[PDB]
Design a protein around this nucleic acid. Structure first.
Ligand SMILES: [Zn+2]
Lengths: 249, 48, 134, 73
RNA sequence: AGUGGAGCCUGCGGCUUAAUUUGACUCAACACGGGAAACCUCACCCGGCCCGGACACGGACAGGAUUGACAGAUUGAUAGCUCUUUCUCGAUUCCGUGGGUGGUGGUGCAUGGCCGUUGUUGGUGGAGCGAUUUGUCUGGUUAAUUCCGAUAACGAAC
């Protein structure tokens, strides 16, 4: 009714927004009850990059992880997937928007990482950019470990190894069930006849430099058999030498 | 759940996973009247 | 002194220990042998078009470019050119070249001056201690 | 290929503006009697969600809320 | 019929400017960049805020790290990206330092993914050791090695 004209006006504001102080009606959006209708009136597909960055900042600042979850699932990730496919790179404002979305890790993991790696259509450039965005942000140990376990459980793609390796690069202490799952994953590549990219080999490598102190003898020989069956002229001797130069417990 | 187990030397934390995978008004017209006053102050037309 | 004459160059190292650093002989003597100090100024071509470019960081004023206008620029990848006009109030300038510059490239100019030796002549030399290794 | 000199140049950016750190701000919220009674110096908001916990910033004339932006005189 | 001579407009040089953005110079340089630009459209100029990675080391943080923020004062701009107000937000941390260490880099090389169908020059023959030549030519004809015809050439592909 009468609020529709105001929200149409701020919709027209957001279509040409570059900077400045936002209208105060936008800053009280997560306090509303029927917020999805208001968001559909504001037309998020027509927002600019800085306006969407400030929208992500507003929704991340106002708690309520489920609303941020549905906002990241419905609005932010389709815009990122559209923007990478067009300009072959991510904008500065949207990069800062995903950083401000990693200001809340719980809504980000279930909202941006897991749907992208579960869709199966994630390209290389999206995977590299997003994994660098995780790499930039300091992350909780339990959250990163659960993301590790979930990525290790799902089906393999060329993108998934990039996230797996870049989460290994954080070098935190890992829960042992997660180590069991990733060992089961790499042993799931024991009998695969598909040719593997260099990213899988590098991910396994960085796993062997970092977590060689927490490898039991059985899985040590299992990864040795994995190196035997799936060799590489350069990286396989490195993993093999790092395996013979490891102390357990 | 895998088969091979970490066996020896301590578990510091149990880790919580059963919450992630198992997951899946006067103010309005006050702020809107403030927005009305704000864009009515955009072109004031009256003050000398 | 008249050649032939052998020439030795020593350096006072420490504790009166003379270290032989150079040796040779005496060439023809004249003060007309010109010694030229060269100073190379480097700039980065940051806007590349065909046969002309916009180059920054070589200078920082506007009249500085106008001062060194008659000096031609060369290039580490072998191009030769000259300054056309400065544009910025900072040290931005237009440079024409014979070919097209790479994005990996770097423009540079050579300036030359004559330098004369110092007058630090004194016939007194300290007596060396016996030489030993360290 | 041909290498670059990497011009050094110094510029001091060590001085950047930072907000002042308030140490032990829990002291001014409550006053404790010798018997053990608690006196609330600041108003508690009767809001929808952040009630019974959020105290008010005391301006020169007015009290202000810091979670839901509540307005008074 | 004009143009070149006159006024105006527009383009390219040249001149000024802080900037008067830019590739192409006798057709394919010359109202091409849909280019009729007062903000965007702009590549140019003059100034002013913001922050610009991971990793290692040393600090602070739970005796809050930090985010968000109403009103008023400021600079050329409603700069909570500063002050009075410091209220909430519970680690999602930010402060120095060191590394030709670096990555949402640039560029080149190698090789492969997405779609279906099964006038020039050869093949064979002749000539010469070979470069080469015949076909691809007396004549008539044709825009044309085209056609009629002759014929050590006969067939063809584009
Ligand atoms: Zn508030």
């Amino acid at each position: 009714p009468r609020v529709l004209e105001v929200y149409r006006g701020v919709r027209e504001v957001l279509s040409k927004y570059r900077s400045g102080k936002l209208p105060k009606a936008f800053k009280i959006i997560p306090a509303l009850s029927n917020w999805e209708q208001i968001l559909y009136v504001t037309e998020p597909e027509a927002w600019t990059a800085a306006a969407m960055y400030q929208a992500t900042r507003i929704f991340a600042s106002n708690l309520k992880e489920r609303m941020a979850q549905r906002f990241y699932n419905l609005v932010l990730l389709p815009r990122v997937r559209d923007d990478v496919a067009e300009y072959k790179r991510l904008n500065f404002h949207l990069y800062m928007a995903l950083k401000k979305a990693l200001f809340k890790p719980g809504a980000w993991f279930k909202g941006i990482l897991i749907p992208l790696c579960e869709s199966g259509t994630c390209t290389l450039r999206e995977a590299i950019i997003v994994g660098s965005i995780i790499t930039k942000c300091s992350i909780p140990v339990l959250h990163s470990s659960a993301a590790m376990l979930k990525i290790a459980e799902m089906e393999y793609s060329g993108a998934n190894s990039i996230f797996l390796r870049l989460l290994l690069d954080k070098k935190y202490a890992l829960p042992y069930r997660v180590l069991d799952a990733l060992v089961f994953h790499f042993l799931g590549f024991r009998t695969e006849k598909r040719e593997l990219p260099v990213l899988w080999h590098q991910c396994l490598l960085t796993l062997v430099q970092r977590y060689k102190a927490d490898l039991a003898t059985d899985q040590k020989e299992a990864l040795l058999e994995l190196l035997r069956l799936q060799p590489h002229p350069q990286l396989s001797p490195e993993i093999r030498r790092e395996l013979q130069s490891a102390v357990p417990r | 759940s895998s088969v091979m187990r970490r066996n020896e030397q301590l578990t510091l934390h149990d880790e919580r996973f059963e919450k992630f995978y198992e997951q899946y008004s006067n103010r309005l017209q006050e702020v809107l009247n403030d927005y009305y006053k704000e864009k009515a102050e955009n072109c004031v037309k009256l003050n000398t | 002194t008249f050649p032939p004459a052998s020439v030795l160059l020593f350096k006072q190292k420490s504790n009166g220990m003379h270290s032989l650093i150079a040796t040779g002989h005496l060439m023809s003597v004249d003060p007309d042998r010109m010694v030229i100090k060269r100073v190379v100024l480097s700039g980065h071509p940051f806007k590349i078009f065909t046969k002309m470019a916009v180059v920054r960081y070589m200078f920082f004023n506007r009249e500085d470019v106008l001062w060194f206008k008659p000096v031609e620029l060369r290039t580490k990848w072998g191009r030769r050119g000259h300054i056309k006009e400065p544009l910025g109030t900072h040290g931005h300038m237009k440079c024409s070249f014979d070919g097209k510059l790479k994005s990996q490239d770097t423009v540079l100019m050579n300036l030359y001056k004559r330098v004369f030796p110092k007058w630090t002549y004194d016939p007194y030399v300290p007596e060396p201690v016996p030489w030993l290794k360290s | 290929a041909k290498k670059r000199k990497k011009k050094s140049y110094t510029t001091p950016k060590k001085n950047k503006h930072k907000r002042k750190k308030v140490k032990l701000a829990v002291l001014k919220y409550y006053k404790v009697d010798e018997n053990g009674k608690i006196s609330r110096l600041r108003r508690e908001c009767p809001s929808d969600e952040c009630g019974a916990g959020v105290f008010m910033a005391s301006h020169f004339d007015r009290h202000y809320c810091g979670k839901c932006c509540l307005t008074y005189c």
